[PDB]
Write an enzyme that holds these catalytic residues in place. Sequence first.
Site, PDB file in Angstrom:
ATOM      1  N   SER A 170      46.188   7.830  13.726  1.00 37.99           N
ATOM      2  CA  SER A 170      45.418   6.661  12.993  1.00 37.99           C
ATOM      3  C   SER A 170      44.100   8.013  12.956  1.00 37.99           C
ATOM      4  O   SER A 170      43.005   8.069  12.488  1.00 37.99           O
ATOM      5  CB  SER A 170      45.366   5.270  12.980  1.00 37.99           C
ATOM      6  OG  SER A 170      46.156   5.229  12.593  1.00 37.99           O
ATOM      7  N   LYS A 200      42.616   9.232   9.822  1.00 29.37           N
ATOM      8  CA  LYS A 200      42.025   8.460   9.539  1.00 29.37           C
ATOM      9  C   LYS A 200      40.611   8.968   9.390  1.00 29.37           C
ATOM     10  O   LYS A 200      39.767   8.995   7.985  1.00 29.37           O
ATOM     11  CB  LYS A 200      41.583   7.189   9.852  1.00 29.37           C
ATOM     12  CG  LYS A 200      42.921   6.451   9.636  1.00 29.37           C
ATOM     13  CD  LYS A 200      42.568   4.671   9.401  1.00 29.37           C
ATOM     14  CE  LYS A 200      43.686   3.933   8.430  1.00 29.37           C
ATOM     15  NZ  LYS A 200      45.474   4.153  10.272  1.00 29.37           N
ATOM     16  N   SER A 230      42.524   0.275  11.624  1.00 28.51           N
ATOM     17  CA  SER A 230      43.627   1.109  11.138  1.00 28.51           C
ATOM     18  C   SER A 230      43.880   0.823  10.287  1.00 28.51           C
ATOM     19  O   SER A 230      45.050   0.618  10.964  1.00 28.51           O
ATOM     20  CB  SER A 230      44.006   1.850  12.509  1.00 28.51           C
ATOM     21  OG  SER A 230      43.207   2.146  13.611  1.00 28.51           O
ATOM     22  N   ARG A 275      43.285   3.434  26.171  1.00 31.34           N
ATOM     23  CA  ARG A 275      42.011   3.935  25.712  1.00 31.34           C
ATOM     24  C   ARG A 275      40.852   4.275  26.003  1.00 31.34           C
ATOM     25  O   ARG A 275      40.002   5.544  27.024  1.00 31.34           O
ATOM     26  CB  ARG A 275      42.785   4.442  24.819  1.00 31.34           C
ATOM     27  CG  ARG A 275      44.459   4.893  23.912  1.00 31.34           C
ATOM     28  CD  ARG A 275      43.716   4.668  22.534  1.00 31.34           C
ATOM     29  NE  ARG A 275      43.943   2.942  22.529  1.00 31.34           N
ATOM     30  CZ  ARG A 275      43.859   2.501  21.031  1.00 31.34           C
ATOM     31  NH1 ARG A 275      45.033   2.775  20.136  1.00 31.34           N
ATOM     32  NH2 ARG A 275      43.337   1.209  20.534  1.00 31.34           N
TER      33      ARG A 275
HETATM   34  C1  LIG Z   1      44.644  -6.128  16.930  1.00 27.31           C
HETATM   35  N1  LIG Z   1      44.368  -4.983  16.426  1.00 27.31           N
HETATM   36  C2  LIG Z   1      43.498  -4.505  15.103  1.00 27.31           C
HETATM   37  O1  LIG Z   1      42.822  -5.268  14.488  1.00 27.31           O
HETATM   38  C3  LIG Z   1      44.021  -3.512  14.367  1.00 27.31           C
HETATM   39  O2  LIG Z   1      45.432  -2.859  14.670  1.00 27.31           O
HETATM   40  C4  LIG Z   1      46.011  -1.878  14.670  1.00 27.31           C
HETATM   41  C5  LIG Z   1      45.066  -1.484  15.898  1.00 27.31           C
HETATM   42  C6  LIG Z   1      45.566  -0.307  16.430  1.00 27.31           C
HETATM   43  C7  LIG Z   1      44.897   0.281  17.730  1.00 27.31           C
HETATM   44  O3  LIG Z   1      45.351   2.043  17.773  1.00 27.31           O
HETATM   45  O4  LIG Z   1      44.587   0.362  18.118  1.00 27.31           O
HETATM   46  C8  LIG Z   1      46.747   0.584  15.631  1.00 27.31           C
HETATM   47  C9  LIG Z   1      47.750  -0.238  14.647  1.00 27.31           C
HETATM   48  C10 LIG Z   1      48.833   0.990  14.390  1.00 27.31           C
HETATM   49  C11 LIG Z   1      48.198   2.357  14.146  1.00 27.31           C
HETATM   50  C12 LIG Z   1      49.435   2.960  12.933  1.00 27.31           C
HETATM   51  C13 LIG Z   1      50.521   2.188  12.866  1.00 27.31           C
HETATM   52  C14 LIG Z   1      51.844   2.168  12.419  1.00 27.31           C
HETATM   53  O5  LIG Z   1      52.283   2.256  11.033  1.00 27.31           O
HETATM   54  O6  LIG Z   1      52.447   4.160  12.817  1.00 27.31           O
HETATM   55  C15 LIG Z   1      50.901   0.560  13.146  1.00 27.31           C
HETATM   56  O7  LIG Z   1      51.976  -0.522  12.829  1.00 27.31           O
HETATM   57  C16 LIG Z   1      51.930  -1.325  12.554  1.00 27.31           C
HETATM   58  C17 LIG Z   1      52.355  -2.068  13.992  1.00 27.31           C
HETATM   59  C18 LIG Z   1      52.324  -3.580  14.628  1.00 27.31           C
HETATM   60  C19 LIG Z   1      52.829  -3.814  15.884  1.00 27.31           C
HETATM   61  C20 LIG Z   1      52.602  -2.128  16.817  1.00 27.31           C
HETATM   62  C21 LIG Z   1      52.490  -1.237  17.055  1.00 27.31           C
HETATM   63  C22 LIG Z   1      52.446  -1.226  15.217  1.00 27.31           C
HETATM   64  C23 LIG Z   1      49.804   0.486  13.531  1.00 27.31           C
HETATM   65  C24 LIG Z   1      47.074  -1.039  14.197  1.00 27.31           C
END
Ligand SMILES: CNC(=O)COc1cc(C(=O)O)cc(-c2ccc(C(=O)O)c(OCc3ccccc3)c2)c1
Length: 242
Positions: A47, A50, A95, A227
Site C-alpha cells: 500500500s 497508493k 489503506s 513500523r
Molecule cells: C485497523 N485497520 C485500518 O484502519 C486500515 O486497514 C488496513 C491497514 C493496513 C496497515 O498497513 O496498517 C493494511 C491494510 C491492508 C493492506 C493490503 C491488503 C491486501 O489486500 O493485500 C489488505 O487486505 C485485507 C487484510 C485484512 C486483515 C489482515 C490482513 C489483510 C489489508 C488494511
Amino acid sequence: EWQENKSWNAHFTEHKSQGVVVLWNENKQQGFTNNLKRANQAFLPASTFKIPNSLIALDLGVVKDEHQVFKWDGQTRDIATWNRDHNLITAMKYSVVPVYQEFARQIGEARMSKMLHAFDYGNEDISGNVDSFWLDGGIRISATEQISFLRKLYHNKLHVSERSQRIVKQAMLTEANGDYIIRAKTGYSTRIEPKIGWWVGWVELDDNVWFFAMNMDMPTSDGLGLRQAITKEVLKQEKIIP
Ligand SMILES: CNC(=O)COc1cc(C(=O)O)cc(-c2ccc(C(=O)O)c(OCc3ccccc3)c2)c1
C-alpha cells in the site's frame, strides 16, 4: 554520501524484529541506514503504492480532487474502516485497497505502465493483475528507491501536474505538532513472501526535511505498530524529533 549505522539494529532487536531504516538529510545531501544491502533490496510496495497510484489517478482525471466521494459498494469486508464511503484523504489513511483497485482499473495497464516508467518507480514492472500488481504482481521497489521517488514528489519534479503532487502530499499528512510534520504512507505486504510492513515518507522540520523509508519482517498483523515505533526511536536517536 551513504553511511551505515549498525547501532539502530538495537531498536529492531529490542522488539524481536528485523528490517531496515533508511534516512536522507535533504540539506546535507547524504544518507544513513542500518543495513546497506537490505536498503537496496526490492520488495513489493504494497500500500505504499497508493502514493504513485494517487498521483496517476489525479493527473488523468480518474479522481477529480481530494473531496470526490467513492461510495462503499455494500460488500462487508474484513476491515471495518473499509466498509464506508471514502475520499482520497480517507482512502489513503485507511489503506482502502478496493478504492485504489477501482482507480487502477480505470487507469488501465497502458497508462499505468507509461506513468511508472515516467516516474522511474522501482523496477517499473506492472506484470500481474491491473488492480493488484502492487500487492501480488511483479512490481518491486527498494527503500532507497522509495526515497528517490519521494524526493521528486517533495520538489514537484514528477511528470504529473504540480497540483497532483500537492494533493498527494496533503493526503500523506500523518502527524503534526509544534516540533515536526510527518507526511508518510504505511504498507503491509502479505500476499507474497516475505511478509513485510513498510513506512515511507519524510519528517518536515523548520529548516530541513528528513526523508525516510523503512521495511521490516511482519509475520503477524499484531506487530504493525512497530513500523512507526521503531522509526520514531531511530528518529529520536538521531535527534530529529524530540
Ligand atoms: C485497523 N485497520 C485500518 O484502519 C486500515 O486497514 C488496513 C491497514 C493496513 C496497515 O498497513 O496498517 C493494511 C491494510 C491492508 C493492506 C493490503 C491488503 C491486501 O489486500 O493485500 C489488505 O487486505 C485485507 C487484510 C485484512 C486483515 C489482515 C490482513 C489483510 C489489508 C488494511
